[PDB]
Amino acid sequence: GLVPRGSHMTAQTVTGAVAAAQLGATLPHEHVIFGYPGYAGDVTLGPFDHAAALASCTETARALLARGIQTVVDATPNGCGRNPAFLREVSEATGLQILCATGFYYEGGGATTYFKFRASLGDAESEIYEMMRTEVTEGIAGTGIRAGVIKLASSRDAITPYEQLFFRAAARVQRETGVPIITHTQEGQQGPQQAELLTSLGADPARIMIGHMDGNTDPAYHRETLRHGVSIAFDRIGLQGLVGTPTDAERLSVLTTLLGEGYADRLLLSHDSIWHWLGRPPAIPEAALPAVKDWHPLHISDDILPDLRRRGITEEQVGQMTVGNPARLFG
Amino acid sequence: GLVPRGSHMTAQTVTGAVAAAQLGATLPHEHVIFGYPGYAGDVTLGPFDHAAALASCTETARALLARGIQTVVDATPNGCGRNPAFLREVSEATGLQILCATGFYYEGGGATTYFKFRASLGDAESEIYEMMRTEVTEGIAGTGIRAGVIKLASSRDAITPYEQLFFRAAARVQRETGVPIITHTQEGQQGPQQAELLTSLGADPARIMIGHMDGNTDPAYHRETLRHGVSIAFDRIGLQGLVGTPTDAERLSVLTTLLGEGYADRLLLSHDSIWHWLGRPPAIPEAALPAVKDWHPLHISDDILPDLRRRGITEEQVGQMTVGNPARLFG
Ligand SMILES: [Co+2]
Ligand SMILES: [Co+2]
Ligand SMILES: [Co+2]
Ligand SMILES: [Co+2]
Ligand code: NA
Ligand code: NA
Ligand code: NA
Ligand code: NA
Ligand code: NA
Ligand code: NA
């Protein structure tokens, strides 16, 4: 198959390097804690309850370990609450391995004023490249905790000039270190584009995972993204009917077709779940209850995998998506 | 003249209440420390140097006190680096009185994802009202440090539906507590609108200061804002040629005309200066040097006031803008 080619480090979780073989079954895109940019501005009424958060998260972590999931990739952008030290707390308490990211969110949902501004004053791309490179080879906020992946995100209608500063910095870093890249696609679009862009910028397709691909239901769109030899991820499984987002029945339709055409080695599955919100706890409006009912990290282990298997998917296919793939991609 | 009418507390600086008579000459809109939303995401390479920052800021503070300026209103939005405890450090070290704000920035330069999101899920206006009310009557992040003013900001083309959530919350709070409101106008527009809106929402025009009014050079625009009986502020004096922003020569042209028509009691003067940047220190491109040369907090005391006086402005007019007005408005 296609093996990563070029410089390579070692999967750097928030508690240290780990050999690819030790990653085990993995959820490639989740969020232990998250907060939309501005949550910090609601600190007075939406303060972080460390004790409550640490207890809640370790609880969830132990439930994953109970299901054989040994590793989780936390994809929280630098502006969206990323807290390595805490993540490390959760990891050290449970034994769950967690990698964290480096990067900012798409123009519309990230804390974009800062670099959008620096961009007008100078070489922001280079500045972003330096931050990424440092966070992936030395550590974050000087804690010694390195990022295990670079997270990129784009908007619906295009990968904006601001978002591209980040794709270029990432490519530089991916080329230089071999670190993996996971991405966020907005409302099921730009998947092929990020693939064309990253590969054209020289980033290794074998270390690239185009995210939120379940956000699109036309399998032609997936087949086109996969042409670039990158991995794609149905990573919001469980979130049904919010922000474009299709139903799982729909996601599984596509998946069984792609699996049916031999794409097992390029497909990963996650929830993009949030275990503990930062800011004021979200007020889930009555009509939205069903949309998020299966939007938790135990959904794939308990509902999805059994559903694929009983449909014809093999134990080997499930094993390739949940263990094989994360192994080669982050390992 | 027009005196504040309705409930009223006491000017709440970051070190306690202070009688209006004790405010002295004041700079109604400055920023001891600031950071565009996202600066926190650049923590690894743009970390906060407390010692260096505390030394730099107290230095600046002492320079203001040396010029008779006894009070500064820090207008930093909740997402833009607001740090009451630190502000209090600077105040306690020098004796400079500082009030801090409560509020978020305009849709385009603030950390707007959070509430723009909560807005779609529920009654964000009410949530924002609660935060504001608490921060102005009880304190911020539970530190006991209360906000002395509510800061509102709008965009260039309109006061957006998101920005209006904030104008409505503020109005509620202004009506209920009597706390002052200072605002940010984008690229010299919406001044009359914020005035129409706030007053129509029942906020006291005698506790309202429409900001960044020097951003517009047509005095017809000022005269129309002033019709609502609110105060207007040429509060970016010193920033010349960046983000619309006119030249001081131009700002003074308008000012001497407004002063010439008897508007002394409704005009305030500030710099919207930043004493210490949060994040990676800003890279000032060669061509921009002149634009920010006079963009520091000693500019009005040393250059502006002497310029007005030598033009015909009286010691009493200068005294009304720099001492009288802040006294009634924040006192
Ligand atoms: Co995403
Ligand atoms: Co996510
Ligand atoms: Co402003
Ligand atoms: Co300002
Ligand atoms: Na558990
Ligand atoms: Na971000
Ligand atoms: Na793969
Ligand atoms: Na000094
Ligand atoms: Na803000
Ligand atoms: Na006034």
UniProtKB/TrEMBL annotation, chains A, B:
Keywords: Hydrolase, Metal-binding, Zinc
Gene3D superfamilies linked: Metal-dependent hydrolases (3.20.20.140)
Molecular function in Gene Ontology: lactonohydrolase activity; zinc ion binding
Alphabetical list of PROSITE patterns matching this protein: PHOSPHOTRIESTERASE_1 (PS01322), PHOSPHOTRIESTERASE_2 (PS51347)
Keyword presence, Nucleotide-binding: no
Binding site for Zn(2+) 2: K151, H184, H212
Binding site for Zn(2+) 1: H29, H31, K151, D272
N6-carboxylysine: residues bearing it: K151
Cofactor-binding details, from the entry: Binds 2 divalent metal cations per subunit.
InterPro entries the UniProt entry points to: AryldialkylPase_Zn-BS (IPR017947), Metal_Hydrolase (IPR032466), Phosphotriesterase (IPR001559)
Cofactor(s) required, per the database record: a divalent metal cation
Family per record: Belongs to the metallo-dependent hydrolases superfamily. Phosphotriesterase family.
Matching PANTHER family: PHOSPHOTRIESTERASE-RELATED, PHOSPHOTRIESTERASE-RELATED PROTEIN
Descriptive protein name: Phosphotriesterase, putative
Organism: Deinococcus radiodurans (strain ATCC 13939 / DSM 20539 / JCM 16871 / CCUG 27074 / LMG 4051 / NBRC 15346 / NCIMB 9279 / VKM B-1422 / R1)
Taxonomic lineage: Bacteria, Thermotogati, Deinococcota, Deinococci, Deinococcales
